């Protein structure tokens, strides 16, 4: 069927804060992953209509992409840094779920995940 | 307006040889790229009538696709491995010529080209 609406990126009913960790997630982590050569299939929601992949949103019921993560950080959607880390992890595991071990797109996602973990290793200490 | 005939894949007046490099180009290179998740647009000649690309064959005068390269290797059309490498390069550059920087199909071709170059980096030594 159609693509779903993209994930929500603003929450008017949630309090907001800036923290060293959230700032780092946007300015360093999201900036480094976006520019990686393997990033583009993960930068926006999968457009299953344009690709003619009717089963994508039958299989992936928790979609996530780097464009959504960028918007959530910019809109202070996340109170805890772990909420953002979970969204990255959802994006990577969605690739592993939809595809098969050893697929090329999976290898791309695995390399992005290794870079993400290397950058998370340098997250500033919690307040 | 119409599609041309596909590229020739047999040459009865050319001598034939089976080499380490040609074997690898079919069994490893052609096979790996064929199975990549981004391979579908490159597996057969561009059907410009069905894709509604009437200017495709006015711009691309040296068409090439993976299916033609596969048949070329199976039929011993190539004497030198470089002849096959040239056909892959023609496939990738045709995509860049017809389309524009940053187009989804160009990013697909670029990923296939980088993987192709990695596999060529491991071509067996020339006899």
From Swiss-Prot, chains A, B:
Record localization: Nucleus; Chromosome
Source superkingdom: Eukaryota
UniProt note on tissues of expression: Ubiquitously expressed.
Site residues by UniProt (Acetylated histone binding): 99
PTM summary: Phosphorylation by CK2 disrupt the intramolecular binding between the bromo domain 2 and the NPS region and promotes binding between the NPS and the BID regions, leading to activate the protein and promote binding to acetylated histones. In absence of phosphorylation, BRD4 does not localize to p53/TP53 target gene promoters, phosphorylation promoting recruitment to p53/TP53 target promoters.
Bromo domain: residues covered: 17-123
Linked residues for Glycyl lysine isopeptide (Lys-Gly) (interchain with G-Cter in SUMO2): 58
Effect in UniProt of substituting residue 99 to A: Abolishes binding to acetylated histones
Subunit structure: Interacts with p53/TP53; the interaction is direct. Interacts (via CTD region) with CDK9 and CCNT1, acting as an associated component of P-TEFb complex. Interacts with RELA (when acetylated at 'Lys-310'). Interacts (via NET domain) with NSD3, CHD4, BICRA and ATAD5. The interaction with BICRA bridges BRD4 to the GBAF complex. Interacts (via NET domain) with JMJD6 (via JmjC and N-terminal domains); the interaction is stronger in presence of ssRNA and recruits JMJD6 on distal enhancers. Interacts with NSD3. Interacts with NIPBL. (Microbial infection) Interacts with bovine papillomavirus type 1 regulatory protein E2. This interactions may serve for the tethering of viral genomes to host mitotic chromosomes allowing successful partitioning of the viral genome during cell division.
The family this protein is said to belong to: Belongs to the BET family.
Protein's job: Chromatin reader protein that recognizes and binds acetylated histones and plays a key role in transmission of epigenetic memory across cell divisions and transcription regulation. Remains associated with acetylated chromatin throughout the entire cell cycle and provides epigenetic memory for postmitotic G1 gene transcription by preserving acetylated chromatin status and maintaining high-order chromatin structure. During interphase, plays a key role in regulating the transcription of signal-inducible genes by associating with the P-TEFb complex and recruiting it to promoters.
Domain notes from UniProt: The NET domain mediates interaction with a number of chromatin proteins involved in transcription regulation (NSD3, JMJD6, CHD4, GLTSCR1 and ATAD5). The C-terminal (CTD) region mediates interaction and recruitment of CDK9 and CCNT1 subunits of the P-TEFb complex. It is also required for maintenance of higher-order chromatin structure.
Disease the record associates with this protein: Cornelia de Lange syndrome 6: A form of Cornelia de Lange syndrome, a clinically heterogeneous developmental disorder associated with malformations affecting multiple systems. It is characterized by facial dysmorphisms, abnormal hands and feet, growth delay, cognitive retardation, hirsutism, gastroesophageal dysfunction and cardiac, ophthalmologic and genitourinary anomalies. CDLS6 inheritance is autosomal dominant.
Note: JQ1, a thieno-triazolo-1,4-diazepine derivative, and I-BET, a benzodiazepine derivative, have been tested on tumors with success. Treatment with GSK1210151A (I-BET151, a I-BET derivative) has strong effets on mixed lineage leukemia and promotes myeloid differentiation and leukemia stem-cell depletion.
This protein's name: Bromodomain-containing protein 4
Gene: BRD4
